[PDB]
Design a protein around this ligand. Structure first.
Ligand code: GDP
Ligand code: GDP
Ligand code: GDP
Ligand code: GDP
Ligand code: GDP
Ligand code: GDP
Ligand code: MG
Ligand code: MG
Ligand code: MG
Ligand code: MG
Ligand code: MG
Ligand code: MG
Lengths: 153, 153, 153, 153, 153, 153
């Protein structure tokens, strides 16, 4: 697995409103992943419907989109080895009722419809989501000073 | 599952003695549950024996009661969707040896006889324990400013 | 002077609403003070007017009483050497604008009308406030296991 | 003082490299201030020289600009009553040797030339800096769910 | 079994380099285990080869020894009931990819070759490792003030 | 001021007993100072009397020595620019009553006779204390991966 894999992590409006931006960023920062893009945005309903396009048939789709419009979103790209899969493990189960304490949802969330955060579920979907949410020049190329202490070659 | 389910959480005398009141409250607070009643108490032996009545035949019962009498207890009622079951998940396994890091017992406790907290194990037992430990006027009715960000309802 | 001095600390409705019960308790717990009474309460209007009786001629009085009625209060008695004066130092300046980072108000508060907490300002006023908010039976007598590590003999 | 005052806070490259993005955001989040703009950027030397234009005569100017180019910057706009002045108090003294523990620089920094963060020093300079670093559509208009618990009218 | 079981925990050079000494110590301290020996050391190559002697035929052996020589190590003996097995549970899976958030590796590490810490995997191996890394005079005999609140009599 | 200045910091027996090893190390670690030596020790009375030789005429001397003998001590050497003076600022005032919240004593201590830590008060006394408490080979030479992000040099 390549250490330059990237995933899209978003803090949903309930996470912003409840003051969880700092703690969520710290979870990824402390694990060793590298922040390569971030912005606070209020995207249009059209972008949100495209982001969740595969769930357009679900009964909760309309409420999910409404909720995702109801406040700011903190959109991020994180980079590191197996960051897509491990990022999902850090976030915890989609339904916080199923999540483990020590994960983001297991520490901070209760309802599946207010589960604080989003993370890409595959490398291919992460590439799709990254291009949907960010312009290429918003990804910052840099090298962490502790890279060789986080990674063995 | 209703968002107004309630559970009885108690910090046992070892949790009070070891300075864990703040941290344990923060676990439930940060998860989004609502504190509706709280008091520091030194309850009489008869109340503790009734709390643990279903264990009256166990060999450890007399020692359990004496330990529960040996210091203050922080008695609490927390309210939220599935707070009984999710509260038990936050507490961790009865025997801390079997508990997961990130739970209260998995972070703070070693011995099953010194496992720093109690949580009701079912909705029906929670109602019974709440009534045993609190007068009805000690349960405070209020609405959290972030209720609609914790719950979809 | 004596290590059995007591002060009245209250978390005001804005501190409860903003999820600061755990963090505020931890400030006093970690410092080495002893919690000897605590309850979540929604006190009557006349109790709050008596609490703030020295302020009844101030223009902000009615609004202060009304806001103090607007949500639950976490009422506490803390015990220890110089706990009245040191408790005020932990709380920080009455106006958070004048408070120092590292204090409760310097970490958590902005407006003097929303300064998250209360602490007695003198030993005599502490005794008055403890007698107003607590029945004597609610003060719990116990000895901390680390008393002789917090205090010299 | 108006509660809609805004200031420019930046995490400098040393703060990003040392993994302080989460903790710094939390300092402002926990105090009650509202995040209304944020982005990770690598601005050109021309923008940085304009940002520090008033220090172009200083002997450390060239080294300061080089250092500000040497890694990513987390640029933010925070909003609240007296946020410019109180933001500076949260950051601590420019020279961390003079800073108090409990501030950002007093907790995390040693050298004036590596002092982790920037904050505007006046309302007028904040307006200048905000327009230098952000496009107007990057400022997100929203209303915190706890606004009325942070502010008294 | 007995509350005087001992294990050897070491913070590897990557944990020291990334500023994780405090957090790792706190994990064991907060759980109730007793620190009975500790030192910062840069041990000789033959001590590390003996530490990992069971792995001398693995292909990664020489690189593991070389990285373990590449910075200081914080070497510790922790004492308590089942501290060997529970210590491994606190550390988390050897490969951080398989570790759970809430453990040391699940909170802080990514690569199996950079997994920030070591813990003995059996009581017999703990005794071997303690005798290899510590002179008996470096194990300090003391009684925790909260022993009887961590352990049942 | 040279970045290779060193100071002697010790966690006194009360800090060890009260579970403050992790937190105190994190204060210095997070500030950017370099740990160059550490050991848990129970030093002989003669060493403690020599450490405090300038207080041999004080009325509290015999009690101070007995308390310093009453449990383990965590002895440390920290290195960095102005670490002697800045270390004292992090520790807070000798008498915790006069200390500021956010310092070690202002967060964790009450009594001057139980003030949880020691720090050298001058560069010359630090060299004397370092030599008293450590053998030269116990001081580990290493270079922090973030050295150039903490210091401008
Ligand atoms: N109300 C409701 N919302 C859901 C449900 N399932 C998913 N969602 C929301 O839709 C988002 C996307 O769903 P999905 O892609 O399947 O899960 P995810 O990849 O873990 O976020 C989730 O994060 C939830 O916020 C559901 O059964 N009910
Ligand atoms: N000494 C001892 N105490 C026990 C044992 N099992 C349970 N306890 C204590 O009894 C309490 C109540 O037991 P139980 O209701 O079955 O578990 P809980 O609902 O998870 O607290 C536990 O929290 C322990 O404090 C045991 O085997 N030995
Ligand atoms: N709106 C407003 N409220 C105030 C003012 N001064 C005090 N208060 C409130 O009144 C409470 C009691 O005032 P005081 O006893 O002087 O301050 P305290 O003992 O430090 O809390 C304070 O904690 C504030 O909540 C003011 O000038 N304006
Ligand atoms: N090397 C060095 N850098 C400095 C000095 N003074 C200021 N700086 C840097 O220049 C930045 C801007 O300086 P200034 O506007 O006066 O202070 P600030 O508004 O508190 O950031 C500071 O944040 C420091 O990073 C100095 O005397 N030496
Ligand atoms: N590069 C690499 N290093 C490994 C591998 N397996 C183990 N290690 C390292 O060797 C150490 C000892 O291995 P082991 O005793 O099996 O794991 P541990 O007891 O859980 O630490 C581990 O902690 C890793 O640092 C591997 O497959 N590849
Ligand atoms: N009981 C008592 N102990 C004291 C007093 N003054 C100092 N001490 C203890 O003596 C230690 C050394 O005193 P000193 O060197 O003057 O202060 P320090 O350098 O800040 O530790 C202090 O840290 C206290 O633990 C006092 O007046 N009474
Ligand atoms: Mg999906
Ligand atoms: Mg039961
Ligand atoms: Mg007052
Ligand atoms: Mg300037
Ligand atoms: Mg092993
Ligand atoms: Mg001295």
């Amino acid at each position: 697995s390549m250490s330059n894999e990237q995933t899209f992590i978003a803090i949903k409006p309930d996470g912003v409103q409840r003051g969880l931006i700092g703690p969520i960023i710290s979870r990824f920062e402390n694990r060793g992943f590298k922040l390569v893009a971030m912005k606070l945005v209020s995207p249009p309903q059209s972008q949100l419907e495209q982001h969740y396009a595969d769930l357009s048939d679900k009964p909760f789709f309309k409420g999910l989109v409404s909720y995702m419009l109801s406040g700011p979103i903190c959109a991020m790209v994180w980079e590191g080895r197996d960051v897509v899969k491990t990022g999902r493990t850090i976030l915890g189960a989609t339904n916080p009722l199923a999540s483990a304490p020590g994960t983001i949802r297991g520490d901070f969330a209760i309802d599946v419809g207010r589960n604080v955060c989003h993370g890409s579920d595959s490398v291919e979907n992460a590439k799709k989501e990254i291009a949907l949410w960010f312009k290429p020049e918003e990804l910052i190329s840099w090298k962490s000073a502790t890279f060789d202490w986080v990674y063995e070659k």
